[PDB]
Structure formats: C-alpha cells, structure tokens
Design a protein around this ligand. Structure first.
Ligand SMILES: COc1ccc(S(C)(=O)=O)cc1-c1cn(C)c(=O)c2ccc(-c3cn(CCF)nn3)cc12
Length: 127
C-alpha cells in the first residue's frame, strides 16, 4: 500500500504575494480551524496506508489538508485569497465525497466548515 506524494507547498517559479487577505486567511481562518477539537484528522495529508484505506486515493484525486494549507500560507505560496479558499473547500468536499453521510469525520468537517464560512464572510477588502 502506498500514499501519493503530498500536494506541493513550494514552487520557486510560481509567482507569489503577501496580501492582507492572505494574512487574514492565516491569522484568523487557519488558526481558528487548527485549534478546534475536530481539527486533528485534517492537520496532515490522509495517510491511507496507516488508516487501511487503499481506495482513498482511487476516489480522491485532488487531496488537500490543513497541514498543506498551513505550509502554503507560511511559505507565501499563493497569489491570492481565492486560491487558498479553494484549498479549504477542496478539503471539505473530499471529506464529503469519500465518506458516508453522518460519519463522525463528516460531522467534524461540517463543524470546521461552519467556522470557515463565518470567518471568510468577513474577509477584509483588499488593500
Ligand atoms: C479520524 O480520521 C482520521 C484520523 C487520522 C488521520 S491521519 C493517519 O492521516 O493523520 C486521518 C483521518 C481521516 C481524515 N479525513 C479527511 C478522512 O476523510 C478520513 C476518512 C476515513 C478515515 C478512516 C476510516 N477508517 C476505517 C473505516 F473505514 N479509519 N480511518 C479517516 C479519515
């Protein structure tokens, strides 16, 4: 059984910015979700080997997790806030695609997603 390589968090030829919106995504959005009691299953790539989920990466072809997002934010990997927002939405959608409705992990994603939506509702206007 094998895991794929993780999503990239560094690419020197990808143009990058540090914007106030991206700072908010790190200081408010990521930090709020990361400290949550339900954050742990989403703090690193899904380890399909250790979890005995050989079909995970057969179904999920765009993996994403908050460990990757955290590294991307700390490395100033993004050009804009929408790119980072898309990563969070990919992570939530993957969870809903792979898992059964009402599974514990789905309730955990839903709780993080509720907070995510509350925080991005107040994404600051770009300076
Ligand atoms: C509590 O969930 C986790 C804990 C630790 C890590 S880990 C080693 O990567 O740090 C990952 C997860 C995890 C995350 N996500 C996003 C998922 O969709 C997901 C889906 C299924 C399972 C799972 C299924 N079964 C057997 C029943 F079929 N056992 N586990 C795990 C996950």
């Amino acid at each position: 059984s094998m895991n794929p390589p993780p999503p990239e968090t560094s690419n020197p030829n990808k143009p990058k910015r540090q914007t106030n919106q991206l700072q908010y995504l790190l200081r408010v959005v990521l930090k709020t979700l990361w400290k949550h009691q339900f954050a742990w299953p989403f703090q690193q790539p899904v380890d399909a080997v250790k979890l005995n989920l050989p079909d995970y990466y057969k179904i999920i072809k765009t993996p994403m997790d908050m460990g990757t997002i955290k590294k991307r934010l700390e490395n100033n990997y993004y050009w804009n806030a929408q790119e980072c927002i898309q990563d969070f939405n990919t992570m939530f959608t993957n969870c809903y695609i792979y898992n059964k409705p009402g599974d514990d992990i789905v309730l955990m994603a839903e709780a993080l997603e509720k907070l995510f939506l509350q925080k991005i509702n107040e994404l600051p206007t770009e300076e």
